[PDB]
DNA sequence: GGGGGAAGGATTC
DNA sequence: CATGGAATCCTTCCCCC
């Protein structure tokens, strides 16, 4: 069982440099401007030139400018990044039939066939990196190991523009030395929760009573970490199918007014429907981000597909139910369509 | 005593 | 001051063998 994981370096920013090579070498910051005021919004991502000064994904654009006022600030162009990503995902398909497109810039390849050991694997990794750089001029990081989790962890250790193999002898020691927070799927909340239980390394999950563990992080997460520490994790690489499509936008001012929110809601619906492109949803959810950043949603499942007209009608009703409950002002609003026919 | 949906929410990348 | 898209996994009904 040999897994090769490919992760594109500072993707959005790298794409912008590809589209304008003169940016190469300068700090580049891809932003999502919300139009609330001059420079309101957040950083989608940034290149390493900017990253070394503390400018990274998630920080307010405003804070990024205080740190690097002379960096290059570019608005996010999602559409473009997706097409570039697709072309790269297609190249990857030429190296294995078993492929899992995990996100817009990640992919796992099951190369248990194409190769018979970590040597051929490491070389197949360079063949792949070299090929992507050559055809799309995009540097990526490769991680190779016994499974998806460790192949991804391996990539995390080598980025940017790297390649690393985590062999069967190195996995065993990581299960003992690796900070459990660096484990994929363990975010700040799960991490700052395993500590209260006394779990700082994967190995620690083996000396605690399952039932206690389950009650703290849930059954799935439980069995997940246990199977990894017990070196038994082995999820198959499989192509995921889009199960939902949607869009959430930011309003200029926080509001509780229906007619003030509608415009944003309808715009989210129009964009979502465009993206559906022939797919017909039976379920619709209206999502609202309140002023204190809490996420509230209301949805309905119909016994048939939802026409754009029905979506408009149903969304307002759902938006009203949200306002009837939480009396908090709404900051962001949008919709999500799922349960395709 | 449990299957199978459906909802509202939680957490991650 | 802090955007945005989508998957998985909870917890709680709910209807009803
Ligand atoms: N907080 C975010 N907001 C909006 N878009 C994001 C955010 N984080 C990541 N993305 C999008 C754009 C990133 O270029 C893309 C890939 O992220 P990754 O997590 O792949 O970061 P990079 O941006 O790839 O950094 P790196 O080289 O460390 O992997 O996903
Ligand atoms: Ca990634
Ligand atoms: Ca990446
Ligand atoms: Ca983490």
Brief digest:
This protein has 341 residues and is an alpha+beta fold. Helix content is 40%, strand content 24%.
Provide structural commentary:
It is a single chain. Helix 6 links the parallel strand 7 and strand 8. Helix content is 40%, strand content 24%. The chain contains twelve helices and twelve strands. It has 341 residues and is α+β, with helices and mostly antiparallel strands. Strands 5-6-1-7-8 form a five-stranded mixed beta sheet. Strands 9-12-10-11 form a four-stranded antiparallel beta sheet, covered by helices on one side. It has four domains: 98 residues, Reverse transcriptase/Diguanylate cyclase domain (Alpha-Beta Plaits, 2-Layer Sandwich), CATH 3.30.70.270; 67 residues, MutS, DNA mismatch repair protein, domain I (3-Layer(aba) Sandwich), CATH 3.40.1170; 67 residues, Orthogonal Bundle (DNA polymerase, domain 1); 98 residues, DNA polymerase, Y-family, little finger domain (Dna Ligase, domain 1), CATH 3.30.1490. The two termini are 35 Å apart. Bound molecules: 2'-deoxyadenosine 5'-triphosphate and calcium ion (CA) (3 copies). The site of 2'-deoxyadenosine 5'-triphosphate (DTP) has 14 residues, from strand 1, helix 1 and strand 3. The site of one calcium ion has 5 residues, from strand 1. The protein binds a DNA duplex (13 and 17 nucleotides) through strand 2, strand 3, helix 3, helix 8 and helix 10.
